[PDB]
Amino acid sequence: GSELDQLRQEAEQLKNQIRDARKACADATLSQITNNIDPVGRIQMRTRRTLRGHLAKIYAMHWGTDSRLLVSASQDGKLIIWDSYTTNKVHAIPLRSSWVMTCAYAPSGNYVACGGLDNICSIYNLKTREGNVRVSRELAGHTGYLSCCRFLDDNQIVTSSGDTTCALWDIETGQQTTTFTGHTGDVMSLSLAPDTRLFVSGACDASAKLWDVREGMCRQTFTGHESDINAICFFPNGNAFATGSDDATCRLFDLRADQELMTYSHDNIICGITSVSFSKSGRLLLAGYDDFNCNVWDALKADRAGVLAGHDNRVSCLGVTDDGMAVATGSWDSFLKIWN
Amino acid sequence: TASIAQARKLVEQLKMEANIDRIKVSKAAADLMAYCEAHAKEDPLLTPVPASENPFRE
Amino acid sequence: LSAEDKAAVERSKMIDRNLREDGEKAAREVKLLLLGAGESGKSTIVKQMKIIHTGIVETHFTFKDLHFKMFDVGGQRSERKKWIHCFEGVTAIIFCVALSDYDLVLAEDEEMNRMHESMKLFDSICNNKWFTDTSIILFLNKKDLFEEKIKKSPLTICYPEYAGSNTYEEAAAYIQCQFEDLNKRKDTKEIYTHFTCATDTKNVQFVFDAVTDVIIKNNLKDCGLF
Amino acid sequence: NYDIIVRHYNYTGKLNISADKENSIKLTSVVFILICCFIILENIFVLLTIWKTKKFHRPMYYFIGNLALSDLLAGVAYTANLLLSGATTYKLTPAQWFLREGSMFVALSASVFSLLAIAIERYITMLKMKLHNGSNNFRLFLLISACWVISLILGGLPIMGWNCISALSSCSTVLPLYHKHYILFCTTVFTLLLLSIVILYCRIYSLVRTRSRRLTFRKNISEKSLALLKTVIIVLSVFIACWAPLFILLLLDVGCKVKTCDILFRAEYFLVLAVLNSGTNPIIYTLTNKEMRRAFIRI
Ligand SMILES: Cc1cc(-c2nc3cnc(Oc4cccc(Cl)c4)nc3o2)cc(C)c1OCC(=O)O
What we know:
A: mainly beta; C: Rossmann fold; 6 strands; transducer (chain B); Guanine nucleotide-binding protein G(I)/G(S)/G(O) subunit gamma-2 (chain B); prenylation (chain B); membrane (chain B)
């Protein structure tokens, strides 16, 4: 009655004034500000390593904090930990349930985090006296399938599940320390910050929201998309972030002001983004696609500057190493490739 | 009634978010491109790397 | 070739050997997905004296020489579109439909007579882009209740176009042809039909026959002799 | 040298004292070179079609490519032999005369061995059922090498032994300077290969029928067996019905004596019929399969 109609009319005026404030502060575009700078030349990249040994599709990959070791996760039920510079393997951890979609490497190189469609999470330990791998925790309590999970510290982890929620957990306690809710679809990916302390996430309700890690409530919301958000990445500076989608329109947003800056798109692409990663300068914005190749795009000019077509099936995971000397791509054809 | 609580917490979120400050997109992009230009000297991805400094080389 | 490099190569060789050894035993197990509505009797089939071993609840059983593996994906309330591409190499998709629910109103939503939304679900799962060469083996649920109810209840409420008699045979055949007429891919995939029987041996033998027919067809297509 | 060749041809009677001008003026030659050019065309389109698609990489496709390459070599061998047939009773050394026939025999044996290898591989794959179908490269390499080596050895054997250059009584009439024992060995090999192929295909069909009909007794509302039978009868009918004439001609040659049978001077038609059969393999081996014709329609 009066309560409900007053409440949503007040929400209407609040939304209108928020949109007015968003429009007022926008005076130009990144293209206008950077209309005088040399375009990046044609980028040539060649495969240097052809890591093989998986017998199913590849769904995730995460670089270590040393640029020496990788992690994969196939549907065969394996969590091979590769070792670059040699192509040899160092671990062949077998999973319990062969339904995995996430990976995580600890920043100190001690533990590995895994989790898929079985509604639980696992933390395997590497540095042990036995010289093997043993499950130390089996964090459970979610309702939907886990979409992503990235380490926050050596004793703190954060996860996002398909029941419109995220959870900041606590290892060695097995308790959901913090809960984040508000989404209406399902959180498909999230990214951390260079200094942590904040994290952004995206769902299938055509939205992208930022969350603090202490008080536990959404700060702002960034709409604009017309499709699902199944990929996200954070700028190294910490004041902007990219966003993929299933309709091949990469977006670049701003934390300081909720604005639309870039609209990365073309006319010969009708597929969907799968992964997005930045570089130290934040100039070469890599991206994945369903049309069997990865197209690296310049961020400032918002135009194509190279194609990494070397795969057979859809690319599913993509990653830039920490210091930066190569990138890793993994598709459904059971092949990991190292471009440089 | 769950709907009234949903609406009231939604409007509380909206009004508490409305108090955030806003910045000029032009100067934000200026700092963005300044950082991009500054932290690009080595950048072994876009800058060509010598063969002797290429670990991923046989 | 130093000592540590040789040790690393030996470790990699052992890891690869073990992985290849373990990857062959998993290539001889037939995977069968299971689907069905809420009150579609998915609990009784997995309890029907055959299964030995939230989210996925994988079940293992063995018949003759084949080692089957059944995934009961029923605990998920999220969108089926974002995780259905994982099940792409499945050999078959068992489907259960409740025959004794042609008149009861669907829960929490009026109408659809507990069968119309079942036909929409079957249409959505059959005419998919990932399932183009997978059988749609279909089990028809409780029939004793169906035959005792149809003897004294009207059928035209769910299908107001049927002028036939109220006998068991004609009604069952009409339901079978209605469910079998939604297969748009008439040349690639085939749908089998079976009325649920109390005996476990009948159902298990039907599943075995269907999967061995699928294996024969797959081998014929692989050899190029099809 | 030249005297031996002319003496052998005079003894056989094929010299005919050829006094025709250098011009070919033969309609048979032109129609046959157009036919073999068509064969080469079909083979080269098959080779490009199988090469372009990345999906076509299974060992079945490798055997098909082997057969296509063998047919391509056979067509070139036939056209080379035909273009040089005019100056056969003069202007030729025994070495080149033997080389022509050796190349011809290698080209006409490689295709038969490729068909045998394809049948063996199909029987092996169909004998045991697997959920995921694959093959070890060892067996593929072994077969694809052994067929070529045995064909080359069979072709190159006459160049040194069984050359009939000394004996004037054991030389055949269709092909002078050839001992009949080599012809008998070749025809025994051919009939053994035919028997093996027929037995293998019959066993495949019988296994499929027995496994399908008896084991499965589901409800009712067998096309696989009918399609398999149709394919088997088509391939066997083509193969025997268009390799029989050369078999019969070789048997008639080894049976008749010199200056006894006045029919053998017609081998060109039987040879071109055999080459036509070898050429029309891709039609059968791509028309039956749905996917190959779909890809061809796409291309
Ligand atoms: C030039 C020429 C060649 C041939 C000829 N080429 C053959 C190749 N193979 C076989 O037997 C096979 C064939 C295939 C597989 C096996 Cl296992 C044995 N018979 C052949 O006959 C015949 C005549 C009349 C010729 O013309 C006479 C001239 O030179 O003037």
